[PDB]
Structure formats: C-alpha cells, structure tokens
Design a binder for these strands. Structure first.
Ligand SMILES: [Mg+2]
Ligand SMILES: [Mg+2]
Lengths: 109, 45, 110, 217, 116
RNA sequence: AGAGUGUAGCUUAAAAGCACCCAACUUACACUUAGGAGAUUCAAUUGACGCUCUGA
C-alpha cells in the first residue's frame, strides 16, 4: 500500500567548512531550506545553494536576522515577537585574502 | 467631561448632509442627534 | 449571522455634482490650522488629567488593599472577590434637561 | 490590637446634564461641521431646495422655504427645561438638583464625644457582616429613604487611619441610579458637594484628601 | 550546532503563541470575556465612543478580542457596537468601569453584557 | 518636628532616546505618513523651594 519513497539522498550540506580556502565560484554549502544564510561575499543560487564570490577563507558566524520589508511572511513573524526579542541566523562569510590588484610600474615615459 | 467622544465627524465617504436635530424620547430628554431634513424638535409618545 | 449596515447606499453615486467647489483662502486655512494645533495640545492635557486620576486612585486603592491586608488577614482575601450583580449592567449618559413637568407626551408615531 | 471598626461610603451621583463646551471646542465644533458639509453627498433636503427653485424659476420665466418655517416655530414653541436649576436656589445645598453638570457626593455632620467633625457617611462594623454588606447598610440608616445605589466591586478606594486604641475608616464607592429621598429637609446636614467645597468642610489631613479618589472630570 | 555553546541561538517559536469562563481561582480573580454594548442613534456618536474605550483598554493592557457591531433597527436607526473585553483585576474592576461612565458623551447607554 | 531626597512619564541619557497627543487610511486597534507639547527647583561640589515617609 505504501509505494514510493525510494528517493536517494540529495548529498547536500556543507562542502567547504570553517577556515577552508575557497576560490570564487566554489559552492560552499548546498541546502534544501535556508539553514545557512549568505553573508559577506557569498551569493545564493536559484536552489538556495551558497557559492563564494571572492577568493578567501570561509567563516561561519551568528548575526541578527533583519528580513526585507517586502518579505511579508517574515515581517509578520517579526511583528509578533516581544519587545526585547532579537532573531539570529547562521551566516556564511568569505574573508577575502588577496587584494584586488597592485599598481605596477609600466614604463618611464 | 462628557465632551470627549462627541466632537465628531462622519468618517464615511458616501454620506448625505446630517443636521443636528434635537430629539426628545418621551419625557423632556433633549438630545442632539444628526438627522436629515432638519426638524430641530423631535418627539415620540 | 453576518449581516450589517456598513454597506454604502446605491443612491450615493449618481448626482455627485452638488459641490464641485472646494476652495478656501489663505487666512481661513491659517486659522483652521492653528485650531488643529491648539486642539492637539488640548486633548493632550485632558488625557493628562485622566492619566492622573487613574494612576493616583490606583495608588490609593492598592495601598488600601495593602492596609486591609496587614490589619485584617481574613478580610483582604474577600475584598478581591467579584460581585455577581454587574452581569446585567447598563447606564444612560447625560442630557441637557432633567426631564420635565408632568406631560404632553405627543407624537403620532407613523 | 484594639481596633475601633469603622466602614464608610462616598456615594457618587452621576451628572444628568452634560458640561457646557469650552471656547476652543465651539470653534472645534463649528470647524467640524464645515468640513463635514464639504464632504457630504447631495442630501435630499438640498435636492428639493436648489433643484426645484431653478425649475420654479423656469415656469415663471416662460416650495421648500415654507417647510423650514414650520421647523423654527416648534423649536421656539416647546421651551427648554433649565440646564441651570442652580442660580435660582444657590443655598439649597440639600437638593439632589444642587449641581446637574458635576459629580455630587453625600456629606453630613456628625458629633462625637470629643470631636465635632463634618463627616463623610460612616458606620461601625462587626466581622460577622461582610465589608460590602456594611456599605450596603449605610444606604438606609442615616439617609432614611428608598434609594437605589449601585456598587461595582468589593475592593476599597481610600484608607486613612487615625488613632486615639486604634481605628481605621474604609471609603467605598457607590452610584445612585435613581433616588426616593423622602424628607429631603431632614434633621441632618447633608450637602451635595462637587470638588472645591470638599476642601472647605473637611479640614484635617485624614479628611482633606478625599478628593484624590473621586472622579475629577 | 548541537554540541556547541551556540546551540539554539536562532530558535524563535517559543516567542510566538501560534495556535472562556470567569476565572476566579484562589486569589487572582478575573472576569471572562465581556461585551460592551453602546447604542445610539448617531453613527458619529457610536463609532467615536467605540474608539475611546478601545484606546482606554490599549493604554491599560486589557485584551480586546473583537470590536464588531450588530446591525440597526428601523424605529430612525439605532446603531449598536460591541467591544469585547477580557481580564480585569480586583482593583481594576471599579476603576476601569467608572471612567467609561465618566466619559459617556450624550445619552449613549453602556452594557457589561456577556457572550452568547 | 525629623529622614529620604528632586532631569517632561521613565531613564548606572548627558538638554538625549523612548513612552505621549491630534489629523488622514483603516468598523476599530495596529502600522504608516503628516503635525503637536514638553523638563535639570531657585541661589554659591555646597546651601535654602517642592515631594515621599516616620510623628504630635
Ligand atoms: Mg526517503
Ligand atoms: Mg536508495
């Protein structure tokens, strides 16, 4: 009677952990729902994947969730909280290692 | 302080003129009630 | 059963031409706008009076059940109780004239 | 401790006549008509007064004013009862129509063995009767009438204690719906007092502060 | 993570209450639901006094569930509005009632009728 | 008479920030947007105008 349910595992979760060196475009963590939210130099795909935007070192932190005011679901969850309540979510950052370029001497004109 | 919620305004948008018509219920109870075609003296037995 | 009278009447649409003239001068708008500010300070004062008589009387009434707590431990456990007589409560507001002389009580009612 | 047991009651007469307006409020009133008139939508009184007279001008170039004349005469016919039944008497301090706009409270004279104190209505009590029952009994001992007073709860309102042997007075709140105050010129000294004369009849520090828990309006 | 001291830093449903008779148990005595009927023949006088008791309750942290109205009766239509109140303490009961008494504008009648 | 003392309603704010009032959208509340009123109790850390209490 119970047919179906033979789905394989998604193999989602963190691909690059804390402190790992990560180039631009490396997928940091694939997820199904928003477990980790993006932070500094980390983008989101259509399927909620977290890819890195700069070359750097991955850091996981906890900061205050302030949703967008057009996101009417979370704002209506924000305005039911008591007066001292602060939400938190785990954010994933990339601390950019290299600078974006130097000034090199080309030619003495 | 029976003048708190009597300084009013019809808070609708489609409403006609409403005249401060004085009404008496049965016994000499003169009460201002907004009512059309201003009578200024209304009564019921 | 959800039936109400908030519905706008159908007759209040068609003949909307009776006042196409909404104009004031400068000084009539000036004296009205001074009135809205002086009434904004006025009701702030009137609700400042009621925030006194609510707070100060509650101060006396909580100190009363503090005084009736210490000096009679069997009588402040009964002043908390509720009278069953406020269930059919009703009170008319005030008027202009306390009622009348005898009579004359007349309208044809139809 | 030796407790002289005293329960008491301030009655609150509800004002039957609403207060007159203030010079800013009548401007706040007359402004509130003019914006309401400007935002109204074609009443049938102005339909049969403005649209008709154009057409009544039309048959004459080739009535509603008589209606409004009938409404001024009856407004002046049936004359109004007095909002002020106070400026005529001015000395009948026992009257239930002493002040119609304000909050009135019973206040009588009592005489003690050591004191001669104008008093708010008191009574001795016993722990056999409930405290809401003592204030129920105060309605028909010193007043001698058939009033209908209404209490709200069982909690007190004002507590000032004085000692000689100890004593406490407990001020409760009621409200008259009606009143059959028979023989209003009684042998007592009952005065209905708004607020300012409560600082005139009750001098000492356990009686000059009854005004802190009566409604200020 | 579970094994870290920052476990449960982002949980929030214990801060949201997502989902009546007269409650006089041992000392903490409070009413059930109340209804406040205000009938007057002015829509201006009934709508504006329905606001003030709601503004009086909000300034005293008294829970107002509904503030609806029942329809009119053609006598001339009498407009009636219901203001639902829950929860008064012993000291609050006489004081919260007497201010709505001491603010009734012009010939509107109160009610502390109850549900159903 | 004595003690505690004292910034608008509150402030381990130092002339502040929240509370607060009206108007318009809202049945209403709420939100928002337009506006509104505000104080260091006076005199040189000190002394005496005001409030709270313990007394007669
Ligand atoms: Mg599976
Ligand atoms: Mg499988």
């Amino acid at each position: 009677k119970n047919l179906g349910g033979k789905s394989s595992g998604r193999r989602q979760g963190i691909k690059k952990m804390e402190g790992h060196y990560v180039h631009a475009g490396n997928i940091i963590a694939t997820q199904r729902h928003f477990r980790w939210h993006p932070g500094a130099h980390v983008g989101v795909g259509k399927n909620k994947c977290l890819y890195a935007l700069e070359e750097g070192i991955v850091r996981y932190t906890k900061e205050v969730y302030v949703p967008h005011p057009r996101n009417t679901e979370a704002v209506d969850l924000i305005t039911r909280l008591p007066k001292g309540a602060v939400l938190y979510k785990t954010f994933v950052h990339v601390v950019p290692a290299k600078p974006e370029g130097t000034f090199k001497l080309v030619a003495m004109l | 302080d029976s003048s708190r919620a009597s300084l009013t305004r019809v808070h609708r948008q489609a409403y006609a003129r409403l005249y401060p018509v004085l009404l008496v219920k049965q016994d000499g109870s003169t009460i201002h009630i907004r009512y059309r075609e201003p009578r200024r003296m209304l009564a019921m037995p | 059963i959800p039936i109400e009278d908030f519905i706008t009447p159908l007759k209040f649409l068609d003949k909307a031409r009776e006042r196409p003239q909404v104009e004031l001068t400068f000084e009539e708008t000036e004296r009205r706008a001074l009135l809205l500010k002086k009434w904004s300070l006025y009701k702030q004062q009137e609700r400042k009076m009621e925030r006194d008589t609510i707070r100060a009387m509650l101060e006396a009434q909580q100190e009363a059940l503090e005084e009736l707590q210490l000096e009679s431990p069997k009588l402040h456990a009964e002043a908390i109780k509720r009278d069953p007589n406020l269930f059919p409560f009703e009170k008319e507001g005030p008027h202009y004239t306390p009622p009348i002389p005898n009579y004359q009580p007349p309208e044809g009612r139809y | 401790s030796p407790w002289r047991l005293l329960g008491a009651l301030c009655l609150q007469r509800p004002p039957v006549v609403s207060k007159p307006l203030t010079p800013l409020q009548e401007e706040m009133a007359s402004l509130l008509q003019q914006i309401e008139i400007e935002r109204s939508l074609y009443s049938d009184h102005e339909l049969r007064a403005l649209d008709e007279n154009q057409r009544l001008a039309k048959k004459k170039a080739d009535l509603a004013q008589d209606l409004e004349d009938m409404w001024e005469q009856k407004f002046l016919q049936f004359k109004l009862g007095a909002r002020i039944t106070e400026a005529d008497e001015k000395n009948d301090r026992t009257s239930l129509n002493r002040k119609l706009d304000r909050n009135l409270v019973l206040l009588v004279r009592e005489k003690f063995g050591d004191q001669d104190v104008w008093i708010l209505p008191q009574a001795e009590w016993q722990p056999g009767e409930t405290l809401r029952g003592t204030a129920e009994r105060t309605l028909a001992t010193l007043s001698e009438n058939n009033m209908e007073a209404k209490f709200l709860g069982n909690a007190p309102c004002g507590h000032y204690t004085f000692k000689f042997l100890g004593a406490k007075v407990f001020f409760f709140k009621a409200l008259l719906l009606t009143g059959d105050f028979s023989q209003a010129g009684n042998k007592g000294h009952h005065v209905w007092v708004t607020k300012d004369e409560l600082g005139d009849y009750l001098k000492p520090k356990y009686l000059a502060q009854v005004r802190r828990f009566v409604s200020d309006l | 993570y579970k094994t870290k001291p920052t476990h449960g830093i982002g949980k929030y449903k214990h801060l949201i209450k997502a989902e009546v008779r007269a409650i006089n148990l041992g000392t903490d005595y409070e009413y059930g639901v109340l209804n406040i009927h205000l009938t007057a023949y002015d829509m201006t006088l009934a709508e504006s006094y329905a606001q003030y008791v709601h503004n009086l309750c909000n300034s005293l942290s008294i829970k107002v569930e509904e503030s609806y109205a029942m329809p009119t009766k053609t006598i001339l239509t009498t407009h009636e509005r219901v203001v639902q109140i829950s929860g008064l303490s012993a000291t609050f009961a006489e004081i919260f009632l007497e201010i709505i008494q001491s603010s009734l504008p012009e010939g509107v009648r109160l009610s502390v009728k109850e549900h159903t």
